[PDB]
């Protein structure tokens, strides 16, 4: 990004508070599976055992 | 029976591609997985990656991804590893085991019962031959005891038949535990224990009884003062 | 990715103690773990599958136990082969690790030792190295906290200490004090001096050396 | 349990009447499956092929 951004208010930005996520679902067909990549705020997202995922 | 022996080649050399083989007692693996334990001197073991007896497929230490390939057949009871690139750390006594075919509980929960012989497989840098024998004269005949002794240092290969007294061995005789070095090689200082009773009598002739040389060093108390 | 400390490390007990191992995971497994005994020369032996399953063949003195990230392992019927280190293995998640390493001890035998100097034979002198040994005989326990001074200073490798495993005729453990040094540092401190402590000596002694003929 | 279990009519008990039933479920690690056991009335099992299924 640019180096100002014009940053009036000086609180902080998105980083920390969003998440790559590279999951991978099913398609239209129910026998086709594709690695989807989305981002996901940290507040949509619980963390389970395995601690990694 | 699932009862599992391995010897593969022994005491190898590092910076090398090691197959460490292994063998069954008849009970076929058709569904059951195998897989490999290594068990470092004294204490910890790590686990090395199992097999899928079933199908093709291996699975790996995360570490040693791509380190360890084995080879599967229509046999059961032929397991035969690859392991790539033995590093230092590898000097560790390998074992087999299979895995739970079914259970009450679960069933394919590795909870592993079958075990094999275990060899102690090192990484030893070089073969260096065999050791020597080396005296420990009291210095007389804080203390009133004169406690002599013996040191064998460099011996090869793993493990080396060492005694006392051509075997007539006396009172509570012993041998320290094997010990490596940094250079690959592998020593040991056998000191016997000593009453503070009887000094100036006993005699511990130290009987270092390698395969190709087996000698018989004398190696009796003396004043040293 | 799951390892697992199992605390504490050592323990010693005698015949029908009452000592229990806990099993400190880094996160929580549920029940799958496993159990195994270490027999000294002998491969391991599956004592507690499933966490709380007694295996079979093996009798109910296994009171073993426990769900989430603890489980504990204790021990009724001691008896003289169970005396061996215990491994509990999880299997929840890949990769697999063992236990961190629990060594049980006897509780008994409790003998003394005596020390003493030795200045190196002919063999070591013409040799490159020589030793100088304050060997410790029928002690106990695996604290041989041996000091030794060479210029004001300590050092290792040369100090060749390897403690025995615990007898069976004496139950007790022998240690040597072997110094594997060459003369180019050997022979250059004259005087050498051993300092060691021990509980089970009621009076522990400091032996010094003198350099062969002195 | 206990065997006398206050038995006034001495019509009978439930064992030989109910199939202690358990099935399969999916798991992370490759090929490896648990027990979620269960109990169920013998009129609501039937057996098609396949025996002990
Ligand atoms: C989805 O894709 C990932 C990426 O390779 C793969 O690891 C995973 O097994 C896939 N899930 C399936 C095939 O169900
Ligand atoms: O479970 C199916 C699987 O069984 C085993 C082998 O015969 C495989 O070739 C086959 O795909």
């Known amino acids: 990004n640019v180096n100002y951004t014009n940053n009036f208010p000086n609180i902080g930005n998105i980083t920390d508070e969003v998440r790559n996520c590279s999951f991978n679902v099913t398609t239209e067909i129910r026998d086709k599976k594709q690695k989807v990549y989305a981002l996901f705020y940290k507040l949509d997202i619980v963390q389970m055992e395995n601690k990694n995922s | 029976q699932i009862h599992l022996q391995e010897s593969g080649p022994g005491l190898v050399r590092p910076s090398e591609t090691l197959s460490l083989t292994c063998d069954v007692s008849?009970?076929?693996?058709?569904?059951?997985?195998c897989s490999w334990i290594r068990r470092l001197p004294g204490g910890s073991l790590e686990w090395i990656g199992r097999?899928?007896?079933?199908?093709?497929?291996?699975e790996s230490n995360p570490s040693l991804t791509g380190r360890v390939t084995m080879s599967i057949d229509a046999t059961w009871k032929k397991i035969v590893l690859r392991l790539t690139s033995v590093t230092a750390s590898d000097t560790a006594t390998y074992f087999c085991?299979?895995?739970?075919?079914?259970?009450?509980?679960?069933?394919?929960?590795?909870?592993?019962?079958?075990w094999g012989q275990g060899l102690l497989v090192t990484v030893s840098s070089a073969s260096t031959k065999g050791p020597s024998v080396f005296p420990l004269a009291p210095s007389s005949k804080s203390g009133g005891t004169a406690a002599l002794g013996c040191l064998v240092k460099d011996y090869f290969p793993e493990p080396v038949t060492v005694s006392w007294n051509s075997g007539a061995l006396t009172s509570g005789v012993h041998t320290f535990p094997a010990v490596l070095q940094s250079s690959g090689l592998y020593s040991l200082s056998s000191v016997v224990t000593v009453p503070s009773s009887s000094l100036g009598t006993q005699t511990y002739i130290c009987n270092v009884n390698h395969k190709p040389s087996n000698t018989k060093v004398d190696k009796k108390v003396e004043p040293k003062s | 990715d799951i390892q697992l400390i199992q605390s504490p490390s050592s323990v010693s007990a005698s015949v029908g103690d009452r000592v229990t191992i806990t099993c400190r995971s880094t996160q929580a497994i549920g029940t799958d773990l496993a159990w195994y005994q270490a027999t000294p020369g002998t491969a391991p032996k599956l004592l507690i599958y499933h966490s709380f399953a007694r295996h079979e063949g093996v009798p109910s003195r296994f009171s073993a136990g426990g769900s989430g990230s603890e489980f504990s392992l204790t021990i009724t019927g001691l008896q003289p082969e169970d005396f061996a280190t215990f491994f509990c293995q999880h299997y929840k998640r890949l990769p697999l690790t063992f236990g961190g390493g629990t060594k049980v001890e006897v509780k008994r035998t409790v003998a003394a030792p005596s020390v003493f100097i030795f200045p190196p034979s002919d063999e070591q002198l013409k040799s490159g190295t020589a030793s100088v040994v304050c060997l410790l005989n029928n002690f106990y326990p695996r604290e041989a906290k041996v000091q030794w001074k060479v210029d004001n200073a300590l050092q290792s490798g040369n100090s060749q200490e390897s403690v025995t495993e615990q007898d069976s005729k004496d139950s007790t453990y022998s240690l040597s004090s072997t110094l594997t040094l060459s003369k180019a540092d050997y022979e250059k401190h004259k005087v050498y001096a051993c300092e060691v402590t021990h509980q089970g000596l009621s009076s522990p002694v400091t032996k010094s050396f003198n350099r062969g003929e002195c | 349990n206990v065997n006398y279990t206050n038995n006034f009519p001495n019509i009978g008990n439930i064992t030989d009447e109910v199939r202690n039933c358990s099935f399969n479920v999916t798991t992370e690690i490759r090929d490896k499956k648990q027990k979620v056991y269960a109990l169920f009335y013998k009129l609501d099992i039937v057996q098609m092929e396949n025996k002990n299924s």
């Open positions: 085991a299979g895995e739970t075919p079914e259970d009450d509980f679960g069933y394919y929960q590795p909870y592993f019962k079958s």
């Open positions: 008849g009970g076929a693996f058709n569904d059951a997985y």
């Open positions: 097999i899928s007896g079933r199908d093709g497929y291996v």
